[PDB]
C-alpha cells in the first residue's frame, strides 16, 4: 500500500541528475512543498550519470535519470530501482539559419554525421531525404554531451537500433559513449550546454531533450523530423510521443527498465523514454520513507496533470504503468 500523504515532521528530499527532467522537477518540488511545507525538496540539473551515481552512493534521495539501470548497475547497488514518473522525448536540433524547413533525418544519416563520413550539410544522403530543400555547403559540426547523460543514452540507442551493423557495433550506446573524434566535434555539459553550443556555430547538430525545445527554438535552432522504423518522419508532439509509448504500455516489465526507442508504431516518434526516479529500497527512517513514497506517488498522479507536463512537452504515464510505479514506490521502507 503506497503512502499518499507525507510525514508531518520535517523531511528533506534531495534530488539531482537528469537535466531533461530538471525543469519539470523544479515545478513538482515547489508544488508539493506548498501543500506540505514540512517537506523540503531540493533539485539540480547534473545529468543522468550523476543522478544514478549519487542515488547509489546515498548523497541524494532521488537520482533523476532518462536511462533505466543496467543489469550491471543493479548488480552493483541492490535496493536501487528506477521508478517511471513520466514520458519524455528528445529532438535533434541544428544551426542552419538559411533553412526554414524541418529537415528530415534518420539514424543511419545521423550516425554517418557523428562518424564523420558525412561532413557537409548538402551531402546527397541528407539532401535525398529533403528533396526540394536548398541545403548549404556548411560543414557539419556534431555536438555530443561531455557529462554522463541520459540524452546520450537515448540518442545512441537510436543510432544503434537504426544502424545496428555500424553504430550499433561501435561505439554503441550508453550514458557515456566514445564518440568518434571527427574534426570539429565538441562536447558540452548538460542540455543547456548543447543548446548554447549548437546556437554558437552554424552547421552544428545536437541531440537535445524536449524540455529544452522551447529554448532551442528561441535561439533560432532548427528542429528535425526523425525517421521511425516504419519509414515515416515525425516531429515530437503530444500525439507522436503517445503513439510511440502506447505499444510499450503493456510490455513494460515490473521493474520498469525498458527501452522505448525506435518503436514499431507507424505514427510513433522514435526517441521517447520514461523519466525515472532512481531511489533505494531503504531510507534513513520511517518519516523519510513515507514522505518519499508520498512525493513519488503525488508526482505520478497530481504531477502528471497536463498543467505540469504540458509546460515541458512531456506525456503522462498510462494507467497500467502508474500501477507498476506505485508497486515499486510501495516497497520504499526503513
Amino acid at each position: 500500500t503506497v503512502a499518499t500523504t507525507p510525514a508531518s515532521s520535517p523531511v528533506t528530499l534531495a534530488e539531482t541528475g537528469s537535466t531533461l527532467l530538471y525543469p519539470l522537477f523544479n515545478l513538482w518540488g515547489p508544488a508539493f512543498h506548498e501543500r506540505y511545507p514540512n517537506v523540503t525538496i531540493t533539485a539540480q540539473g547534473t545529468g543522468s550519470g550523476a543522478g544514478i551515481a549519487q542515488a547509489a552512493a546515498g548523497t541524494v534521495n532521488i537520482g533523476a535519470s532518462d536511462a533505466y539501470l543496467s543489469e550491471g548497475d543493479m548488480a552493483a547497488h541492490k535496493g536501487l530501482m528506477n521508478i517511471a514518473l513520466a514520458i519524455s522525448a528528445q529532438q535533434v536540433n541544428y544551426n542552419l539559419p538559411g533553412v526554414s524547413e524541418h529537415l528530415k533525418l534518420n539514424g543511419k544519416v545521423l550516425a554517418a554525421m557523428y562518424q564523420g563520413t558525412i561532413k557537409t550539410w548538402d551531402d546527397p544522403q541528407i539532401a535525398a531525404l529533403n528533396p526540394g530543400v536548398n541545403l548549404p555547403g556548411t560543414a557539419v559540426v556534431p555536438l555530443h554531451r561531455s557529462d554522463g547523460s541520459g540524452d546520450t543514452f537515448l540518442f545512441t540507442q537510436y543510432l544503434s537500433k537504426q544502424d545496428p551493423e555500424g553504430w550499433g557495433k561501435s561505439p554503441g550506446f550508453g550514458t557515456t559513449v566514445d564518440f568518434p573524434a571527427v574534426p570539429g566535434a565538441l562536447g558540452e555539459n548538460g542540455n543547456g550546454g548543447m543548446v548554447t553550443g549548437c546556437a554558437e556555430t552554424p552547421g552544428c547538430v545536437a541531440y537535445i531533450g524536449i524540455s529544452f525545445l522551447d529554448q532551442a527554438s528561441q535561439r533560432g535552432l532548427g528542429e528535425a523530423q526523425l525517421g521511425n522504423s516504419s519509414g515515416n518522419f515525425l516531429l515530437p508532439d503530444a500525439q507522436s510521443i503517445q503513439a510511440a509509448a502506447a505499444g510499450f504500455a503493456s510490455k513494460t516489465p515490473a521493474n520498469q527498465a525498458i527501452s522505448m526507442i525506435d518503436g514499431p508504431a507507424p505514427d510513433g516518434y522514435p526517441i521517447i523514454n520514461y523519466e525515472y526516479a532512481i531511489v533505494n529500497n531503504r531510507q534513513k527512517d520511517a518519516a523519510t520513507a513515507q514522505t518519499l513514497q508520498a512525493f513519488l506517488h503525488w508526482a505520478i498522479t497530481d504531477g502528471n496533470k497536463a498543467s505540469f507536463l504540458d509546460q515541458v512537452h512531456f506525456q503522462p504515464l498510462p494507467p497500467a504503468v502508474v500501477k507498476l510505479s506505485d508497486a515499486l514506490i510501495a516497497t520504499i521502507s526503513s
Partner: antibody
Amino acid sequence: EVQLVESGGGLVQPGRSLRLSCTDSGFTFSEYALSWVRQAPGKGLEWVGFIRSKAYGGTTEYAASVKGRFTISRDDSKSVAYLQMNSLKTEDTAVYFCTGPRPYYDSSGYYPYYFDYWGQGTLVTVSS
Amino acid sequence: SALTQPRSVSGSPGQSVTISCTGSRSDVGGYDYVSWYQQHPGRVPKLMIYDVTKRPSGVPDRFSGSRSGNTASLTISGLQADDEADYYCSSFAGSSTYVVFGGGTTLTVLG
C-alpha cells in the same frame, strides 16, 4: 539491368539547336537519375547535367558551362531521356554519353552517385 | 580541370603506380563520393573505384583507392599490358557544382 543507347548526334551550325535522346532497354529507367557526360575529341570527361527520378521531383541540374542553354527532360513511359541543346558553340563539339548509376544509399534517383552504365556515345559536331 | 591529376604516369610490368587527384574541402575532402574511371582508346569509361576505396564487382583488387585530406589517389599494382589507359578521378562537389572530374591520366607500361 541498364542498357543505354544515345541517338540524334551529327552536324549542327553554331547558334542553332540539337536534341539528343537516351533510351534504356532495361526495366529500371524510372528508378535512377539519368546523366549526360561529354568528351571533346582527345580531351577529358565533362559532366553536362542530370535529371532526377520522379520519386524526387524529376528536377534537373547542369554544369555552369551549359546552364541556360541545355535542358534535360525524361519520358518514363518510353524509358527515354532527352538532352536539348540550344545556342550551340564550337566548344560544344564532343561525344555525348548518357550514363546511369546502380542503386546507392537508396537514393540513386536523387543523385547519380557513380556512373556504372554508359551508352556508346554519339558525336555532335558544331561547325559552319 | 576541376580536380588536378598528373597528365602522365608510368610503371614497369609487375610494379605499382599511383595516380593522384588533388581537390579541396568542397569536393574530395568534403564528402566520401570519390570515384575512378578507366578509359581505353575509343571505348566508354568503366567505373573502377567508388566510395573512395570500393571496387565494383569485376574490378580486381590490384586497383586500390585511398585519400589523404583533399587528395585522392588511385593505386594500380601488378601492372599488366592492358592497364595502358586513361584514368579519371571524380567527386561530388556540393549542391551548386555537383559533379567534377579530373583532367585524366594516361598510363604507360614501360617494358
